[PDB]
Specification:
The structure is a homodimer. By secondary structure, chain A is of the alpha/beta class. Chain A has one domain: Rossmann fold, CATH 3.40.50. Helix content of chain A is 30%, strand content 24%. Chain A has 5 helices and 9 strands. In chain A, strands 2-1-3-7-8-9 form a 6-stranded mixed sheet, covered by helices on one side. A 3-stranded antiparallel sheet of chain A has the order 4-5-6. In chain A, helix 4 crosses helix 5. The radius of gyration of chain A is 16 Å and the shape is globular. The interface between A and B is medium-sized, with 24 and 24 residues. Strand 9 of chain A pairs antiparallel with strand 8 of chain B, so a sheet runs across the interface. The structure holds the ligand *SCCNC(=O)c1cc2cc(F)ccc2[nH]1 (2 copies). One ligand FXN sits at the interface of chains B and A. Chain A: This is Caspase-7. Chain A: GO terms for molecular function: aspartic-type endopeptidase activity; cysteine-type endopeptidase activity; cysteine-type peptidase activity; peptidase activity; RNA binding. Chain A: Its EC number is 3.4.22.60. Chain A: One of its GO terms (biological process) is fibroblast apoptotic process. Chain A: Keywords: Acetylation, Allosteric enzyme, Apoptosis, Cytoplasm, Hydrolase, Nucleus, Phosphoprotein, Protease, RNA-binding, Secreted, Thiol protease, Ubl conjugation, Zymogen.
């Protein structure tokens, strides 16, 4: 078929990492408005049919252990997997509370060879990294650099109105448009091999 | 307004850089089959409706001037623009005949403002090598008859280039080369849906 099979017991997991406060040492300030993002997103993704977990002010070691343990779960009865990262960022790196880890190490755990239960299933990453290569099939990255957040608000609004009738590329194209109309722009890196509808 | 407005005199320009033979001083081999690639691409994109021109074994400066002059042209009557790159590739950089040149420098000429006539219109880059940012750019990037990527892109486009949206085409391309076994990507900064008709 031309779209991902969605006939599973569940839609799948949605991990939200909400980093607001950072250790003085990192020279990063409070990320005001992120709670509003985190909350809109969890409500939104809950409503699509995801099982949402929300983590807050995580260390670098937590974000790593967190995701690794998620990648070691049994995803057989799930349609897909989503992870949302709201934090500080610089080229190819995301901030924990105590430092900096490469976005690539975070996503690497969900790789065909190390996460057999999610093979041929979409793995979704929405990164909202304010202050500034995992090349494998069925990955998708929605990265935004624009400083709740415009990107996050737009994602949520389009998703709650069209989440069940549009394909992700359509959703995220529309998102790109309105963070663009508010006037930087978000992007989308797709390695997807089918079309993705969150419905049945 | 959910789709890019295609109502113009022409679809637009489509430059093809087809680098096969490389200057000794780079120790880069003959890219056999890149000619079957470039011919496949020419016929396909011409059939979509692009004004296609093919340039062979371009040097680094040729590639730069090609694209700068290209951006300097008047694009008032065109729906969009498309560049296809067939070469050797490393990290964020293409090869000319006479060495290497960074991808971004090629697209820099087409930015939001340096090419005011292409503003609000899709600039498509199809790269087959073996940042940067901005509204209405799209990259289809691959690593490896001709290459599996090209062969897939041409077949799907020959068949659905007139009824499917750009992202649907490229997703099918992705799936197709994946079936053969690396995987092509799509970087999208598009703000609308893209159809090659109406
Ligand atoms: S929002 C994605 C950020 N930029 C990239 O990751 C990127 C740009 C680009 C351009 C190319 F020609 C090929 C690959 C590529 N990745
Ligand atoms: S074909 C593109 C290869 N990888 C990238 O260019 C890439 C991956 C990635 C992941 C992100 F979270 C953000 C941007 C990004 N570009």
């Amino acid at each position: 078929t031309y779209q991902y099979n969605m006939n599973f017991e569940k839609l799948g997991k949605c991990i939200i990492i909400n980093n607001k406060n950072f250790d003085k040492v990192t020279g990063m300030g409070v990320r005001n408005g992120t709670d509003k993002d985190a909350e809109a997103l969890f409500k939104c993704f809950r409503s699509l049919g995801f099982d949402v977990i929300v983590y807050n002010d995580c260390s670098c070691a937590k974000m790593q252990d967190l995701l690794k343990k998620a990648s070691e779960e049994d995803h057989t009865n799930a349609a897909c997997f989503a992870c949302i990262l709201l934090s500080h960022g610089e080229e190819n790196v995301i901030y924990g509370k105590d430092g900096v880890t490469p976005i690539k190490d975070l996503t690497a755990h969900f790789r065909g060879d190390r996460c057999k239960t999610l093979l041929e299933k979409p793995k979704l990453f929405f990164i909202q990294a304010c202050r500034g290569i995992p090349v494998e099939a069925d990955f998708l990255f929605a990265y935004s650099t624009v400083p709740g957040s415009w990107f996050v608000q737009a994602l949520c609004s389009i998703l709650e109105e069209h989440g069940k009738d549009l394909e992700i590329m359509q959703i995220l194209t529309r998102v790109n448009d309105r963070v663009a109309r508010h006037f930087q722009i978000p992007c989308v890196v797709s390695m997807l091999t089918k079309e993705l509808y969150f419905s049945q």
